[PDB]
């Protein structure tokens, strides 16, 4: 063939209700096509004018058919509810785009009877909490800030655990949890002492050649190891080189005690020699040593004796006083933890001191949150006294458009507030309501019949009607019938203008404003009799058939 599928659209040119009045309709299905909308014979759509206004998604309608309303009066209004109801608290005038946001707290925990303030010293300003029992805690999280689940929220500030140099680490019944490291260390599950050599490790690389100190040599703090390294410490200097070149320099703290075959003491160089017992005959310990057999240094073969010191760890580290005000499914909390960051006997290879157990505040929330949650903290103010508390809240953050002034196709708008800055809400409140205000006033028509789907309402003004005098006459039109210009409605009187007459009395007939389409054979049909349009909306398409050059 020679021809070409072409489709005009078939868009109205005025906001109204759709009429069929001789239009047969078909749904049409194929095999593939499926449904299709098309007016077999063609006919005429018809639109009734009126002003239409769609409707925000939430919109309930607060007027019926028939009813007649002032200008700017309410025809729908929408409601802005709450899923998971708790304590709302209203933010400020940011004009965040124009919308306004409000905050629904869903659970809170706060650290009563701890006071938190602004550490203006140690360089730059760092909040600290400190508690009734005078702990001061660094917190580690800005005001403001997110905070997720399982985060270090402060951290003690302690010197208890602080060192002097690196050393070795063993653990005396206490017991951790096998964690990563992950999370900065194992956390004590079960208390009891952690005991600490010291040994002052330097990692190096020059030649033997450089050393000024013989292995094994008891040395002071000050002296010079190597030409460019001084120890920090006094001990027995530790000498490993393997390629002819230092690896490194230990310096191990403790008492020499000269002895001759060392290896033929009885307490073995498995260390760990209580107070009072008898390393060799004649040598007692003193204070909680550990044994290290050295030969080959100056002054011939010796045991030395490394003072280990101890730290007690309890099972729980104390825990501030908090208030919760946990609520729909959310239990917030901050747990208290103590973290080992190094392992049950790990050589810790270090010249300055060691923090071996740090005590932090954990955030713990999820007991039946969906995907957990974040926690927004913030530094309030304490109700009764006059000092500054943190609080840890879940909120939920809701925003309503602010409003709109009326356009063609939606009337004004104007939201109101129905809850306070303090109030307790439960789930499902309604917290604003929004009216859709009327462009002119008239008379509603066409409410979209089936419910939660009214999204257009038509409202006829005195724009879309027309009042016709019949003087003497009694008029010729009836109530259905559709006049077009110049057409006899009563004697002596004829149509203005394309309507349908809606009222029909003696002296007077009331038309309402139309307008038809015609719409040729098997078109797509856009729309169904009843659909409110606007201006601009399509009504159908046609499918011609066009001469094709080529």
Known sequence: ?????????????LAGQVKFVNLDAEEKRDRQGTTTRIAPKGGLIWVLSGEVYNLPPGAEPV????????????????????????VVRL????????????????????????????????GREHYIIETATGQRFSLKAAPGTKVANGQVVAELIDDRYHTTTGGILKYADIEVAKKGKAKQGYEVLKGGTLLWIPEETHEVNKDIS???????????????????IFCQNSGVVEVIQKNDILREIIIKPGELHLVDDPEAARLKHGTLARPGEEVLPGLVVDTLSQVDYLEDTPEG??????????????????????????????????????RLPYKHDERVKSVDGVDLLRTQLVLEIGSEAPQLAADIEIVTDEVDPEAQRLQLVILESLIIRRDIAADQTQGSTFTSLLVKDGDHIGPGAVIARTDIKAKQAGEVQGIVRSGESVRRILVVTDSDRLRVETNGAK?????????????????????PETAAVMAVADDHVILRLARPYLVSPGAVLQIEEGDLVQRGDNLALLVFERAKTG
């Open 63 to 86: 007027v019926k058919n028939g009813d007649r309303i002032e200008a700017g009066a309410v025809m729908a209004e929408t409601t802005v509810k709450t899923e998971h109801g708790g």
């Open 91 to 122: 933010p400020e005038q940011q004009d965040s785009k124009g919308g306004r946001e409000v905050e629904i707290i869903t659970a809170s925990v706060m650290l009563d009877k701890a006071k938190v303030l602004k550490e203006t010293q140690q």
């Open 210 to 228: 450089l050393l000024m100190v013989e292995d094994n040599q008891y040395v002071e703090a000050g002296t010079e190891v190597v030409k460019d």
């Open 1 to 13: 063939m020679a021809t070409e599928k072409v489709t005009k659209d078939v868009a109205s040119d």
């Open 475 to 495: 008029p010729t039109v009836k109530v259905g019938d559709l006049v077009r210009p110049g057409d006899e409605m009563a004697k002596g009187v004829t149509a």
């Open 301 to 338: 073969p010796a045991i030395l004796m490394r003072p280990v010191q101890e730290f007690s760890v309890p099972d729980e580290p104390s825990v501030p006083s908090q208030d919760s005000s946990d609520g729909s499914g959310q239990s917030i909390r901050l747990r208290a933890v103590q």
